[PDB]
Write a protein that binds this ligand. Structure first.
Ligand SMILES: [Co+2]
Length: 247
């Protein structure tokens, strides 16, 4: 990993010692990026609904993961499921139980710094993983990228700014998350978002990873080439909001 400060450095070091799982995968990859493209052609708003109990910058939420997942299954293009333990109060078991309960694509949301974490995601039933440009050296980023690919996963590669983007494009990310959040400082910046979206080639599947709040905004971004939308905290508080966003 790169040089990091504060909680991010702590979560990286901790992630390096994450115990691997020996579960076996009992179902093919249902590709997230391909379903998003499917939804785009049928003109269905593609939302990746996120299950997140806790985070350093947000509010704690206790709720039944299975009820949440089964509800979202009706509406979302996929699910994002936090497996980071210390800061996000996630679990491998939650992902495992969720993935066996639904048949839409699942994305494991964690801090992936070693190969066996990608083994965990596959073995647990996840269909893809997120990789952070910020936490990995460019070399680590590309090795884990291809490691993901060897399982048949196209990873969501997260960028926050143009420095991250130059890297993601150089190495040929086909599936990119434009996040308004810098993980290290925890600062949120939505104004760079559209400028960044404008710089991505039309062949990459683009995810807007921010608190999208209304249909008008979704329609605008959609005209700008955003393919899908990752929504977490607002759905964690009021799940049925997803219905109004899609109509
Ligand atoms: Co991030």
């Amino acid at each position: 990993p790169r040089y990091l400060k504060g909680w991010l450095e702590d979560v990286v070091q901790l992630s390096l010692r994450r115990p691997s799982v020996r579960a076996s995968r009992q179902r093919p990859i249902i590709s997230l990026n391909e379903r998003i493209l499917e939804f785009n052609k049928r003109n269905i708003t593609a939302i990746i609904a996120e299950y997140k109990r806790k985070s350093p910058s947000g509010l704690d939420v206790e709720r039944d993961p299975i009820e949440y997942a089964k509800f979202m299954e009706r509406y979302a293009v996929g699910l994002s499921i936090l497996t980071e333990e210390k800061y996000f109060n996630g679990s491998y078991e939650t992902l495992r139980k969720i993935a066996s309960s639904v048949s839409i694509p699942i994305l494991m949301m964690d801090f992936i710094v070693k190969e066996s974490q990608i083994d965990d995601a596959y073995n647990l039933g996840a269909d893809t993983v997120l990789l952070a440009v910020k936490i990995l050296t460019e070399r680590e980023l590309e090795s884990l990228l291809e490691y993901a690919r060897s399982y048949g996963m196209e990873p969501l590669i997260e960028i926050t700014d143009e420095n991250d983007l130059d890297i993601a494009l150089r190495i040929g990310a086909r599936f990119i998350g434009i996040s308004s959040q810098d993980d290290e400082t925890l600062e949120i910046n939505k104004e760079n978002q559209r400028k960044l979206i404008s710089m991505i080639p039309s062949n990459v599947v683009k995810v807007a990873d921010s608190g999208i709040s209304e249909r008008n905004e979704i329609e605008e971004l959609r005209k700008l080439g955003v393919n899908a939308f990752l929504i977490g905290s607002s759905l964690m508080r009021n799940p049925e909001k997803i219905k109004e966003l899609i109509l």
